[PDB]
């Protein structure tokens, strides 16, 4: 769920999870266009991951799941079902991805109007 998402992103660092609430063309509810940068790419991959989970019959934005933060690293589990495995994997992946990026203030609250209609394919 969103609580775990914010949690994992905050565990790995280096900035507040709120910094990605609405950024570029993909960080924030929905999203389309050409990713603006590395961070926007992480959100693109995350959206893709969430779509895959939804197709797997899960609820990425609501179901909670257990996990641990150790030395700024996310450890997933224990999982009670396959969905908790999937969700934690998505969040763990965007957290790691996001952790390796530089922040571009110019994309904070970027107008979706400036984002293209089409989007790159999902892996």
**Shortest gap between Cβ of 13 and Ca ion (angstroms)?**
21
Contact 41, 35 (CB under 8 A): yes
For Ca ion, which is the closer residue by CB, 31 or 45?
Answer: 31
Does position 47 bind Ca ion by CB under 5 A?
yes
Residue 46 falls in the annotated catalytic set: yes
Task: Identify which range of 6-14, 46-54, 60-68, 98-106 contacts Ca ion by CB under 5 A.
Answer: 46-54
For Ca ion, which is the closer residue by CB, 33 or 76?
Answer: 33
Angle between helices 38-55 and 82-99 (to 10 degrees): 170
Does position 31 bind Ca ion by CB under 5 A?
yes
Applying CB under 5 A, the site for Ca ion has a residue count of: 3
Strand 67-70 to strand 73-76: parallel, antiparallel, or no bridges (unpaired)? antiparallel
61: Cβ contacts below 8 Å, ≥ 6 apart: 1, 2, 50
For Ca ion, which is the closer residue by CB, 7 or 69?
Answer: 7
**Shortest gap between Cβ of 28 and Ca ion (angstroms)?**
6
What phi and psi, each to the nearest 5 degrees, are found at residue 76?
-85, 130
Which helix (H) or strand (E) element contains residue 69? strand 67-70
Catalytic residues: 46, 91
């Amino acid at each position: 769920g969103i609580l775990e998402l914010a949690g994992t992103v905050g565990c790995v660092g280096p900035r507040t999870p709120i910094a990605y609430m609405k950024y570029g063309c993909f960080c924030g509810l929905g999203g389309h266009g050409q990713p603006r940068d590395a961070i926007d790419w992480c959100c693109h991959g995350h959206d893709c991951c969430y779509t895959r989970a939804e197709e797997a019959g899960c609820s990425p934005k609501t179901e909670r799941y257990s996990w641990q933060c150790v030395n700024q690293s996310v450890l997933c589990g224990p999982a009670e079902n396959k969905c908790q495995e999937l969700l934690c994997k998505c969040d763990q992946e965007i957290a790691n991805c996001l952790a390796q990026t530089e922040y571009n203030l110019k994309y904070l609250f970027y107008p979706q109007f400036l984002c293209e209609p089409d989007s790159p394919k999902c892996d």
